[PDB]
Amino acid sequence: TADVQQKLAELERQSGGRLGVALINTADNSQILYRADERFAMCSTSKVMAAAAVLKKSESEPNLLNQRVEIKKSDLVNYNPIAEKHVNGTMSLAELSAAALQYSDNVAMNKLIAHVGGPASVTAFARQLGDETFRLDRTEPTLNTAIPGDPRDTTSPRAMAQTLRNLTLGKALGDSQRAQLVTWMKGNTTGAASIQAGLPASWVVGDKTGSGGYGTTNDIAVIWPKDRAPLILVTYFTQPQPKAESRRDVLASAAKIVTDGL
Ligand SMILES: *C(=O)[C@@H](NC(=O)/C(=N\OC)c1csc(N)n1)[C@@H]1N[C@H](C(=O)O)[C@H](CS)CS1
Protein backbone atom coordinates (compact mmCIF):
# COMPACT_ATOMS: atom_id res chain seq x y z
CA THR A 1 0.00 0.00 0.00
CA ALA A 2 1.15 3.54 -0.78
CA ASP A 3 -0.25 4.49 2.62
CA VAL A 4 1.72 1.91 4.66
CA GLN A 5 5.07 3.63 4.19
CA GLN A 6 3.43 6.97 4.92
CA LYS A 7 1.69 5.57 7.97
CA LEU A 8 4.89 4.08 9.43
CA ALA A 9 6.41 7.47 8.69
CA GLU A 10 3.86 9.35 10.80
CA LEU A 11 3.85 6.61 13.42
CA GLU A 12 7.60 7.16 13.65
CA ARG A 13 7.37 10.94 14.02
CA GLN A 14 4.46 10.96 16.44
CA SER A 15 6.38 8.35 18.42
CA GLY A 16 9.46 10.55 18.29
CA GLY A 17 12.10 7.98 17.45
CA ARG A 18 13.74 5.78 14.84
CA LEU A 19 11.56 2.88 13.67
CA GLY A 20 12.93 -0.14 11.80
CA VAL A 21 10.51 -2.64 10.29
CA ALA A 22 10.74 -5.69 8.08
CA LEU A 23 7.76 -7.93 7.33
CA ILE A 24 7.97 -11.09 5.23
CA ASN A 25 4.66 -12.52 4.00
CA THR A 26 5.34 -16.15 3.21
CA ALA A 27 2.08 -16.21 1.23
CA ASP A 28 3.65 -14.42 -1.72
CA ASN A 29 7.17 -13.76 -0.37
CA SER A 30 6.36 -10.09 -0.35
CA GLN A 31 7.98 -7.74 2.12
CA ILE A 32 7.28 -4.45 3.83
CA LEU A 33 10.46 -2.59 4.78
CA TYR A 34 11.02 0.66 6.65
CA ARG A 35 14.65 1.53 7.36
CA ALA A 36 15.10 -2.18 6.78
CA ASP A 37 18.82 -1.77 6.06
CA GLU A 38 19.85 0.34 9.07
CA ARG A 39 21.52 -1.08 12.16
CA PHE A 40 19.56 -1.22 15.41
CA ALA A 41 20.64 -2.42 18.81
CA MET A 42 19.31 -5.96 19.07
CA CYS A 43 19.01 -6.06 22.83
CA SER A 44 17.40 -9.27 24.07
CA THR A 45 15.98 -10.10 20.62
CA SER A 46 19.55 -11.28 20.12
CA LYS A 47 18.72 -14.22 22.39
CA VAL A 48 17.13 -16.12 19.46
CA MET A 49 20.48 -16.34 17.65
CA ALA A 50 22.35 -17.65 20.67
CA ALA A 51 19.78 -20.37 21.38
CA ALA A 52 19.61 -21.17 17.67
CA ALA A 53 23.41 -21.46 17.74
CA VAL A 54 23.16 -23.96 20.61
CA LEU A 55 20.39 -25.79 18.71
CA LYS A 56 22.56 -25.99 15.62
CA LYS A 57 25.33 -27.55 17.74
CA SER A 58 23.11 -30.24 19.26
CA GLU A 59 22.55 -31.49 15.70
CA SER A 60 26.22 -32.51 15.75
CA GLU A 61 26.39 -33.45 19.46
CA PRO A 62 23.59 -35.92 20.23
CA ASN A 63 22.75 -34.56 23.64
CA LEU A 64 24.21 -31.10 24.27
CA LEU A 65 20.77 -29.94 25.39
CA ASN A 66 21.03 -32.19 28.47
CA GLN A 67 24.46 -31.13 29.63
CA ARG A 68 24.12 -29.41 32.99
CA VAL A 69 25.48 -25.93 33.65
CA GLU A 70 26.44 -24.42 36.99
CA ILE A 71 24.53 -21.39 38.24
CA LYS A 72 26.99 -19.57 40.55
CA LYS A 73 25.62 -16.81 42.79
CA SER A 74 28.40 -14.85 41.13
CA ASP A 75 26.66 -15.45 37.79
CA LEU A 76 23.58 -13.36 38.63
CA VAL A 77 23.22 -10.13 36.67
CA ASN A 78 20.49 -7.50 36.52
CA TYR A 79 17.63 -9.77 35.35
CA ASN A 80 17.68 -13.45 36.50
CA PRO A 81 14.10 -14.72 36.99
CA ILE A 82 14.82 -18.43 36.43
CA ALA A 83 18.57 -18.88 37.10
CA GLU A 84 18.19 -17.33 40.55
CA LYS A 85 16.12 -20.40 41.40
CA HIS A 86 19.14 -22.62 40.69
CA VAL A 87 22.09 -20.84 42.28
CA ASN A 88 24.51 -23.49 43.51
CA GLY A 89 22.61 -25.78 41.18
CA THR A 90 22.68 -26.37 37.43
CA MET A 91 20.47 -25.93 34.40
CA SER A 92 20.59 -27.80 31.12
CA LEU A 93 21.23 -25.92 27.92
CA ALA A 94 17.65 -26.83 27.03
CA GLU A 95 16.58 -25.17 30.28
CA LEU A 96 18.72 -22.11 29.67
CA SER A 97 17.50 -21.61 26.06
CA ALA A 98 13.96 -21.90 27.31
CA ALA A 99 14.60 -19.53 30.20
CA ALA A 100 16.37 -17.06 27.90
CA LEU A 101 13.70 -17.15 25.19
CA GLN A 102 10.58 -17.17 27.32
CA TYR A 103 11.57 -15.04 30.36
CA SER A 104 14.45 -13.08 28.83
CA ASP A 105 16.69 -14.38 31.62
CA ASN A 106 20.00 -12.56 31.32
CA VAL A 107 22.12 -15.24 33.03
CA ALA A 108 20.92 -17.91 30.61
CA MET A 109 21.89 -15.71 27.69
CA ASN A 110 25.36 -15.40 29.18
CA LYS A 111 25.52 -19.16 29.57
CA LEU A 112 24.43 -19.68 25.94
CA ILE A 113 27.09 -17.28 24.72
CA ALA A 114 29.58 -19.21 26.83
CA HIS A 115 28.87 -22.64 25.38
CA VAL A 116 29.06 -21.52 21.74
CA GLY A 117 32.35 -19.78 22.44
CA GLY A 118 31.69 -16.11 23.07
CA PRO A 119 29.85 -13.49 21.04
CA ALA A 120 32.16 -13.70 18.02
CA SER A 121 31.27 -17.32 17.43
CA VAL A 122 27.56 -16.59 17.74
CA THR A 123 28.24 -14.08 15.00
CA ALA A 124 30.12 -16.84 13.18
CA PHE A 125 26.94 -18.89 13.31
CA ALA A 126 24.98 -15.99 11.79
CA ARG A 127 27.50 -16.04 8.97
CA GLN A 128 27.00 -19.77 8.42
CA LEU A 129 23.37 -18.79 7.86
CA GLY A 130 24.41 -16.26 5.25
CA ASP A 131 23.57 -13.38 7.60
CA GLU A 132 26.29 -10.78 7.06
CA THR A 133 24.80 -8.06 9.25
CA PHE A 134 24.25 -9.61 12.65
CA ARG A 135 27.05 -8.98 15.15
CA LEU A 136 27.07 -9.98 18.80
CA ASP A 137 29.88 -8.15 20.61
CA ARG A 138 29.18 -8.13 24.37
CA THR A 139 27.65 -10.15 27.21
CA GLU A 140 24.64 -9.48 29.37
CA PRO A 141 23.88 -6.92 30.65
CA THR A 142 25.98 -4.43 28.69
CA LEU A 143 24.96 -5.58 25.19
CA ASN A 144 21.67 -3.68 25.64
CA THR A 145 23.29 -0.23 25.86
CA ALA A 146 21.73 0.76 22.52
CA ILE A 147 23.95 3.87 22.57
CA PRO A 148 23.14 5.53 19.22
CA GLY A 149 25.61 5.39 16.36
CA ASP A 150 27.29 2.44 18.11
CA PRO A 151 27.37 -0.66 15.86
CA ARG A 152 28.07 -3.21 18.56
CA ASP A 153 25.40 -5.87 19.08
CA THR A 154 23.28 -4.55 16.17
CA THR A 155 21.70 -5.85 12.97
CA SER A 156 19.17 -4.71 10.37
CA PRO A 157 15.44 -5.47 10.17
CA ARG A 158 15.92 -7.10 6.77
CA ALA A 159 18.72 -9.38 7.98
CA MET A 160 16.91 -10.46 11.12
CA ALA A 161 13.62 -11.20 9.30
CA GLN A 162 15.27 -13.35 6.66
CA THR A 163 17.32 -15.08 9.36
CA LEU A 164 14.31 -15.64 11.63
CA ARG A 165 12.41 -17.10 8.65
CA ASN A 166 15.35 -19.42 7.90
CA LEU A 167 15.37 -20.60 11.55
CA THR A 168 11.66 -20.96 12.38
CA LEU A 169 10.38 -21.87 8.90
CA GLY A 170 13.36 -22.62 6.66
CA LYS A 171 16.06 -25.26 6.92
CA ALA A 172 18.84 -23.50 8.86
CA LEU A 173 18.15 -26.08 11.57
CA GLY A 174 17.13 -29.71 11.33
CA ASP A 175 13.47 -30.51 11.65
CA SER A 176 13.63 -31.36 15.37
CA GLN A 177 15.60 -28.21 16.33
CA ARG A 178 13.36 -25.94 14.24
CA ALA A 179 10.32 -27.32 16.06
CA GLN A 180 11.99 -26.80 19.43
CA LEU A 181 12.83 -23.16 18.73
CA VAL A 182 9.23 -22.49 17.67
CA THR A 183 7.81 -24.20 20.74
CA TRP A 184 10.13 -22.04 22.86
CA MET A 185 9.29 -18.77 21.12
CA LYS A 186 5.63 -19.75 20.95
CA GLY A 187 5.90 -19.98 24.73
CA ASN A 188 7.39 -16.54 25.39
CA THR A 189 5.90 -14.74 28.39
CA THR A 190 7.23 -11.25 27.63
CA GLY A 191 5.55 -10.34 24.32
CA ALA A 192 1.94 -9.58 25.12
CA ALA A 193 2.34 -5.81 24.70
CA SER A 194 4.58 -5.64 21.60
CA ILE A 195 4.01 -7.14 18.11
CA GLN A 196 1.25 -9.33 19.53
CA ALA A 197 -0.82 -6.40 20.86
CA GLY A 198 -1.11 -5.19 17.24
CA LEU A 199 -2.56 -8.38 15.88
CA PRO A 200 -6.00 -9.99 16.05
CA ALA A 201 -6.26 -11.80 19.34
CA SER A 202 -6.71 -15.11 17.51
CA TRP A 203 -3.39 -15.25 15.65
CA VAL A 204 -0.63 -17.43 17.11
CA VAL A 205 2.63 -15.58 17.82
CA GLY A 206 6.11 -16.78 18.58
CA ASP A 207 8.23 -13.76 19.47
CA LYS A 208 11.30 -12.55 21.34
CA THR A 209 11.20 -9.07 22.87
CA GLY A 210 14.14 -6.80 23.49
CA SER A 211 14.68 -3.63 25.46
CA GLY A 212 17.59 -1.44 26.38
CA GLY A 213 18.96 2.02 26.86
CA TYR A 214 17.66 4.99 24.88
CA GLY A 215 14.08 3.74 25.08
CA THR A 216 15.01 0.91 22.74
CA THR A 217 12.04 -1.44 22.35
CA ASN A 218 12.28 -4.43 19.98
CA ASP A 219 10.34 -7.56 19.03
CA ILE A 220 10.85 -10.23 16.39
CA ALA A 221 8.08 -12.66 15.73
CA VAL A 222 6.87 -15.51 13.55
CA ILE A 223 3.08 -15.29 13.17
CA TRP A 224 0.53 -17.91 12.08
CA PRO A 225 -2.80 -16.18 11.39
CA LYS A 226 -5.73 -18.51 11.24
CA ASP A 227 -6.24 -19.82 7.69
CA ARG A 228 -3.17 -18.00 6.35
CA ALA A 229 0.52 -18.50 5.62
CA PRO A 230 2.83 -17.27 8.38
CA LEU A 231 4.48 -13.88 8.56
CA ILE A 232 7.92 -12.94 9.85
CA LEU A 233 7.83 -9.52 11.50
CA VAL A 234 10.83 -7.61 12.88
CA THR A 235 10.11 -4.29 14.63
CA TYR A 236 12.96 -2.28 16.14
CA PHE A 237 12.42 1.09 17.77
CA THR A 238 14.93 3.44 19.30
CA GLN A 239 14.91 6.84 20.97
CA PRO A 240 17.29 9.81 21.30
CA GLN A 241 17.07 10.42 25.03
CA PRO A 242 19.23 7.96 27.02
CA LYS A 243 16.54 7.62 29.70
CA ALA A 244 13.53 7.66 27.35
CA GLU A 245 10.97 5.14 28.53
CA SER A 246 10.07 1.92 26.74
CA ARG A 247 7.39 2.12 24.05
CA ARG A 248 6.08 -1.36 23.43
CA ASP A 249 2.88 0.19 22.02
CA VAL A 250 4.94 1.61 19.16
CA LEU A 251 5.76 -1.95 18.11
CA ALA A 252 2.09 -2.91 18.31
CA SER A 253 1.03 0.03 16.14
CA ALA A 254 3.76 -0.87 13.68
CA ALA A 255 2.50 -4.45 13.58
CA LYS A 256 -0.98 -2.86 13.28
CA ILE A 257 -0.02 -0.78 10.22
CA VAL A 258 1.76 -3.60 8.35
CA THR A 259 -0.87 -6.31 8.80
CA ASP A 260 -3.95 -4.19 7.88
CA GLY A 261 -5.21 -6.27 4.97
CA LEU A 262 -3.94 -9.71 6.07
C1 LIG B 1 16.17 -8.27 26.78
O1 LIG B 1 16.31 -7.45 25.91
C2 LIG B 1 15.09 -8.13 27.87
N1 LIG B 1 15.52 -7.45 29.05
C3 LIG B 1 16.85 -7.33 29.58
O2 LIG B 1 17.79 -7.85 29.06
C4 LIG B 1 16.92 -6.48 30.85
N2 LIG B 1 17.98 -5.91 31.18
O3 LIG B 1 19.17 -6.04 30.44
C5 LIG B 1 19.75 -4.77 30.22
C6 LIG B 1 15.64 -6.28 31.70
C7 LIG B 1 15.56 -5.28 32.71
S1 LIG B 1 14.00 -5.40 33.38
C8 LIG B 1 13.46 -6.68 32.40
N3 LIG B 1 12.14 -7.29 32.47
N4 LIG B 1 14.48 -7.01 31.57
C9 LIG B 1 13.97 -7.17 27.50
N5 LIG B 1 13.32 -6.64 28.72
C10 LIG B 1 11.70 -6.86 28.61
C11 LIG B 1 10.89 -6.10 29.68
O4 LIG B 1 9.62 -6.02 29.58
O5 LIG B 1 11.46 -5.55 30.67
C12 LIG B 1 11.37 -8.48 28.70
C13 LIG B 1 11.60 -8.97 30.12
S2 LIG B 1 9.98 -8.90 30.93
C14 LIG B 1 12.27 -9.20 27.78
S3 LIG B 1 12.85 -8.08 26.76
Residue numbers in the entry: 27 to 288
Give the authors' words.
Cefotaximase-Munich (CTX-M) extended-spectrum beta-lactamases (ESBLs) are commonly associated with Gram-negative, hospital-acquired infections worldwide. CTX-M-15, which belongs to hydrolases (EC 3.5.2.6), cleaves lactam carbon–nitrogen amide bonds rapidly, deactivating β-lactam antibiotics. To understand the mechanism of CTX-M-15 activity, we have determined the crystal structures of CTX-M-15 in complex with two specific classes of beta-lactam compounds, desfuroylceftiofur (DFC) and ampicillin, and an inhibitor, clavulanic acid. The binding pocket of CTX-M-15 for those β-lactams was established by the residues from both the α- and α/β-domains, surrounded by the catalytic residues Ser70, Lys73, Ser130, and Glu166.
After parenteral administration, ceftiofur is rapidly metabolized into desfuroylceftiofur (DFC) and furoic acid through cleavage of its thioester bond. The complex crystal structure of CTX-M-15 displayed that the DFC molecule was also covalently bound to Ser70. Upon superimposing the structure of its apo and complex structure, obvious conformational changes were observed for Ser70, Asn104, Asn132, Asn170, Thr216, and Ser237. The carbonyl oxygen of the acyloxyl group in the acyl-enzyme intermediate was again stabilized by the backbones of Ser70 and Ser237 in the oxyanion hole. The carbonyl oxygen atom of the amide group in DFC was within a hydrogen bond distance from the backbone and sidechain of Ser70, and its nitrogen atom was also within a hydrogen bond distance from the backbone and sidechain of Ser237. The thiol group attached to the cephem ring showed a hypervalent interaction with the sidechain of Thr216. The bridgehead nitrogen in the cephem ring showed a polar interaction with the sidechain of Ser237, and the sulfur atom in this ring showed interaction with the sidechain of Ser130. Overall, CTX-M-15 showed higher catalytic efficiency for DFC and nitrocefin than ampicillin and ceftiofur.
